[PDB]
Design a protein around this ligand. Sequence first.
Ligand SMILES: CCCCCCCC/C=C\CCCCCCCC(=O)OC[C@H](COP(=O)(O)OCC[N+](C)(C)C)OC(=O)CCCCCCC/C=C\CCCCCCCC
Ligand SMILES: CCCCCCCC/C=C\CCCCCCCC(=O)OC[C@H](COP(=O)(O)OCC[N+](C)(C)C)OC(=O)CCCCCCC/C=C\CCCCCCCC
Ligand SMILES: CCCCCCCC/C=C\CCCCCCCC(=O)OC[C@H](COP(=O)(O)OCC[N+](C)(C)C)OC(=O)CCCCCCC/C=C\CCCCCCCC
Ligand SMILES: CCCCCCCC/C=C\CCCCCCCC(=O)OC[C@H](COP(=O)(O)OCC[N+](C)(C)C)OC(=O)CCCCCCC/C=C\CCCCCCCC
Ligand SMILES: CCCCCCCC/C=C\CCCCCCCC(=O)OC[C@H](COP(=O)(O)OCC[N+](C)(C)C)OC(=O)CCCCCCC/C=C\CCCCCCCC
Ligand SMILES: CCCCCCCC/C=C\CCCCCCCC(=O)OC[C@H](COP(=O)(O)OCC[N+](C)(C)C)OC(=O)CCCCCCC/C=C\CCCCCCCC
Ligand SMILES: CCCCCCCC/C=C\CCCCCCCC(=O)OC[C@H](COP(=O)(O)OCC[N+](C)(C)C)OC(=O)CCCCCCC/C=C\CCCCCCCC
Ligand SMILES: CCCCCCCC/C=C\CCCCCCCC(=O)OC[C@H](COP(=O)(O)OCC[N+](C)(C)C)OC(=O)CCCCCCC/C=C\CCCCCCCC
Ligand SMILES: CCCCCCCC/C=C\CCCCCCCC(=O)OC[C@H](COP(=O)(O)OC[C@H](N)C(=O)O)OC(=O)CCCCCCC/C=C\CCCCCCCC
Ligand SMILES: CCCCCCCC/C=C\CCCCCCCC(=O)OC[C@H](COP(=O)(O)OC[C@H](N)C(=O)O)OC(=O)CCCCCCC/C=C\CCCCCCCC
Ligand SMILES: CCCCCCCC/C=C\CCCCCCCC(=O)OC[C@H](COP(=O)(O)OC[C@H](N)C(=O)O)OC(=O)CCCCCCC/C=C\CCCCCCCC
Lengths: 198, 198
Amino acid sequence: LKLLDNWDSVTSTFSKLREQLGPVTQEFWDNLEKETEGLRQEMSKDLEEVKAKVQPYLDDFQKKWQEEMELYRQKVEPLRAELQEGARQKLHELQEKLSPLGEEMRDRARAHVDALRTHLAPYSDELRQRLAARLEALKENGGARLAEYHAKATEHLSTLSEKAKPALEDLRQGLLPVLESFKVSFLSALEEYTKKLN
Amino acid sequence: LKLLDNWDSVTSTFSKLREQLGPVTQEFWDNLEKETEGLRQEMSKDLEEVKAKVQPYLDDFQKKWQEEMELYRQKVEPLRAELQEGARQKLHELQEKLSPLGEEMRDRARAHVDALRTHLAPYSDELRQRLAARLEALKENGGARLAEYHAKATEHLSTLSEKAKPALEDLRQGLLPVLESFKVSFLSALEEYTKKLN
Ligand SMILES: CCCCCCCC/C=C\CCCCCCCC(=O)OC[C@H](COP(=O)(O)OCC[N+](C)(C)C)OC(=O)CCCCCCC/C=C\CCCCCCCC
Ligand SMILES: CCCCCCCC/C=C\CCCCCCCC(=O)OC[C@H](COP(=O)(O)OCC[N+](C)(C)C)OC(=O)CCCCCCC/C=C\CCCCCCCC
Ligand SMILES: CCCCCCCC/C=C\CCCCCCCC(=O)OC[C@H](COP(=O)(O)OCC[N+](C)(C)C)OC(=O)CCCCCCC/C=C\CCCCCCCC
Ligand SMILES: CCCCCCCC/C=C\CCCCCCCC(=O)OC[C@H](COP(=O)(O)OCC[N+](C)(C)C)OC(=O)CCCCCCC/C=C\CCCCCCCC
Ligand SMILES: CCCCCCCC/C=C\CCCCCCCC(=O)OC[C@H](COP(=O)(O)OCC[N+](C)(C)C)OC(=O)CCCCCCC/C=C\CCCCCCCC
Ligand SMILES: CCCCCCCC/C=C\CCCCCCCC(=O)OC[C@H](COP(=O)(O)OCC[N+](C)(C)C)OC(=O)CCCCCCC/C=C\CCCCCCCC
Ligand SMILES: CCCCCCCC/C=C\CCCCCCCC(=O)OC[C@H](COP(=O)(O)OCC[N+](C)(C)C)OC(=O)CCCCCCC/C=C\CCCCCCCC
Ligand SMILES: CCCCCCCC/C=C\CCCCCCCC(=O)OC[C@H](COP(=O)(O)OCC[N+](C)(C)C)OC(=O)CCCCCCC/C=C\CCCCCCCC
Ligand SMILES: CCCCCCCC/C=C\CCCCCCCC(=O)OC[C@H](COP(=O)(O)OC[C@H](N)C(=O)O)OC(=O)CCCCCCC/C=C\CCCCCCCC
Ligand SMILES: CCCCCCCC/C=C\CCCCCCCC(=O)OC[C@H](COP(=O)(O)OC[C@H](N)C(=O)O)OC(=O)CCCCCCC/C=C\CCCCCCCC
Ligand SMILES: CCCCCCCC/C=C\CCCCCCCC(=O)OC[C@H](COP(=O)(O)OC[C@H](N)C(=O)O)OC(=O)CCCCCCC/C=C\CCCCCCCC
């Protein structure tokens, strides 16, 4: 009823919008005329001059690129040679800093890893002794704990059920009048709500 | 009242748990103490064993490290000389290259910049010519644009009044009875809600 009237004004609004779109597009397209023509007047010489600018620019850039290429050739090539020789020298350096050092590092390893062998081997063995004692303690105390847990759990399970029995009975006992009372509230609610929603 | 009944059952559980927590923490403290007693008994032993054994361990690694460092320093000396004399040549060759290749690069740069300067000069002026033409077109185009857009704005405002007046009064005209229906429903709905609450 109300929405129907709302739509009426909406229709008029849409109709008036169409009446707007008319002159709007007429002038818009006409605006686009000057827009495209103006841009054409701009871009015509802009593009023609663009070529007349890019031509000498690419020409100048090519020349500069050639100079840079020559620069790179007259630099990178001899530089690579210098760096190659320098690297070769550094390689010789590295060879003297890798061969006598690497072989020494391996000897150091003999006095490190192999030395640690006779250090960690007894250590792990002693660790096993410590582990055995600790594990046995954890087994003695653990077994006792298992019994303790079993006992405490039994005392808990029994009391839990001893409370679950009356709790469940009371819960169900209360649920009866409670659900009924709530049902009464739901029934009245449903009936009252349906009246307002009609 | 239901919240209070439940709360009372929570107080009792928390109290029972606390009363049990007493012997629980006591038994735990006792057990933990016995565990730590052994742990400390073994800790002192382990610590002493580790300390006594760490002596030859650290002593050995100390001697090893000393020899390692001595050889490292005894080698780093000539190695530093290699790097020094090597770098001296590497840098000398680079310096004797940085001068000619640097000056030649600057010479090329002179041409690079010169050719660019003599190009950018007319280029920027030609760009100014473009800007003058572009902005000029934008003046004629923009002038018509703003005028046309303004004209369409006036028409939009006139047709906006065709909404700001009729449609707005229509909206308010609908809002009045709508508010009535809303008041009747919402006001009574609040009553309905309270009916089930309390
Ligand atoms: C100064 C003047 C001289 C210039 C020096 C030369 C530099 C330029 C040369 C090479 C650069 C290569 C960079 C590596 C990039 C890839 C990394 C990566 O993706 O790696 C993953 C692979 C996986 O394993 P894979 O079996 O599939 O690959 C090996 C199998 N294949 C080789 C058959 C393909 O792992 C590997 O390649 C791991 C291989 C371990 C590499 C050992 C290096 C041995 C050589 C020298 C010792 C270095 C001393 C350092 C001195 C300091 C200088 C500042
Ligand atoms: C499902 C449940 C299972 C649990 C799984 C266990 C996994 C956890 C494992 C590793 C993480 C390490 C964390 C355990 C210890 C943290 C205790 C803690 O929360 O520390 C922080 C509290 C904060 O207080 P504060 O220090 O800032 O204040 C006092 C201020 N005043 C001193 C500074 C001035 O400090 C205190 O509580 C005081 C300090 C207490 C120090 C305890 C460290 C004891 C060390 C070794 C015991 C060995 C155990 C070996 C295990 C094998 C058993 C067979
Ligand atoms: C205030 C905040 C505190 C929160 C406290 C709440 C705690 C509530 C208590 C326990 C939580 C876990 C309960 C779940 C155990 C079910 C036992 C049961 O009903 O088993 C019979 C089922 C029969 O087969 P089905 O096809 O029906 O089941 C397949 C199940 N479906 C259909 C999903 C595929 O068999 C099975 O599930 C297979 C047997 C699995 C046996 C597991 C024994 C593990 C033992 C020790 C680990 C300790 C866990 C600690 C928790 C308990 C402390 C007392
Ligand atoms: C009052 C004492 C009650 C004892 C009776 C059994 C009822 C359980 C009761 C309380 C414990 C509560 C917590 C249970 C948690 C998960 C329950 C569940 O849903 O568990 C099945 C799932 C499914 O994975 P799955 O079982 O295929 O993989 C495991 C096998 N895979 C890896 C080893 C080869 O496992 C998981 O969540 C992972 C945990 C699997 C634990 C298995 C332990 C089974 C222990 C005993 C069975 C026989 C009891 C008979 C003797 C007692 C008579 C009173
Ligand atoms: C059928 C139904 C099933 C039954 C349900 C079973 C599930 C258990 C459920 C509930 C437990 C009861 C609720 C807790 C009671 C409250 C105790 C208490 O008074 O609470 C508060 C304290 C302090 O808190 P606050 O500083 O903010 O207050 C200070 C106050 N103000 C802010 C004013 C300064 O909180 C504390 O004491 C909390 C300490 C921090 C949390 C520690 C958790 C440790 C858990 C495991 C460790 C494992 C031990 C075993 C393994 C060995 C490891 C070595
Ligand atoms: C046989 C003998 C065996 C002995 C070993 C047995 C087991 C270990 C047990 C006990 C030993 C622990 C005690 C020694 C630790 C050092 C504590 C310490 O002296 O403490 C403070 C220092 C300094 O303080 P500062 O340098 O900051 O200040 C600089 C300050 N300015 C410049 C102003 C001056 O700090 C430090 O020594 C920094 C070390 C602590 C920070 C570690 C890094 C933490 C961050 C990230 C962890 C990684 C996460 C990523 C996930 C991993 C995935 C695998
Ligand atoms: C053909 C018909 C032609 C006729 C129409 C005429 C053309 C309209 C032309 C021009 C209108 C521009 C007017 C506004 C100019 C002022 C701009 C300005 O000065 O700005 C700055 C102010 C900041 O203030 P402050 O620095 O003092 O404060 C800062 C204080 N604090 C940070 C510290 C705490 O910022 C602000 O005012 C922020 C304002 C943000 C409001 C945006 C509203 C957008 C509207 C609709 C959404 C539609 C998007 C289009 C998509 C359509 C899809 C269908
Ligand atoms: C047995 C029965 C049991 C009972 C159970 C109870 C459960 C319900 C529990 C909690 C509900 C939340 C209650 C919030 C109470 C306060 C409401 C209020 O007075 O709040 C307004 C404030 C004002 O804002 P302010 O401080 O920034 O501005 C002023 C800035 N000064 C002061 C600096 C100038 O709000 C703010 O602070 C934050 C803004 C967030 C709210 C925006 C809403 C704006 C209005 C309309 C848009 C939404 C329409 C609804 C569409 C949804 C349909 C589903
Ligand atoms: C933060 C960044 C730092 C840069 C780090 C670079 C390190 C790279 C690592 C290792 C060396 C790699 C050395 C590579 C040498 C090979 C160069 C070459 O010809 O490359 C060809 C490519 C061609 O790509 P395409 O995509 O066209 O074709 C590939 C194909 N379509 C595909 O999908 O796979 O060209 C390109 O990718 C782009 C053009 C490049 C032109 C060359 C331009 C080089 C010019 C001059 C030399 C370098 C200057 C040295 C200065 C010293 C002088 C003083
Ligand atoms: C105050 C409120 C009190 C009630 C409160 C209830 C609360 C419940 C609890 C929680 C809120 C739950 C909120 C749930 C929201 C979402 C519910 C939902 O699942 O919606 C989706 C369905 C889906 O329809 P589609 O079936 O066509 O196809 C399924 C879909 N593609 C898919 O993949 O699932 O659409 C439908 O429901 C179509 C139903 C068509 C039946 C006919 C419906 C038409 C019924 C009556 C019309 C009578 C005519 C009246 C006018 C008379 C004059 C002409
Ligand atoms: C069922 C309908 C029945 C019809 C009912 C009609 C009646 C409507 C009644 C009233 C209209 C309200 C008209 C409100 C106009 C603006 C009112 C205004 O300026 O309010 C001020 C607030 C300021 O909040 P602040 O939190 O900033 O508080 C001020 C600040 N703290 C201080 O100290 O100074 O600004 C805001 O919160 C922003 C307002 C956001 C609300 C708009 C939100 C716009 C939401 C949606 C519009 C987008 C539509 C998208 C559709 C897409 C679908 C296809």
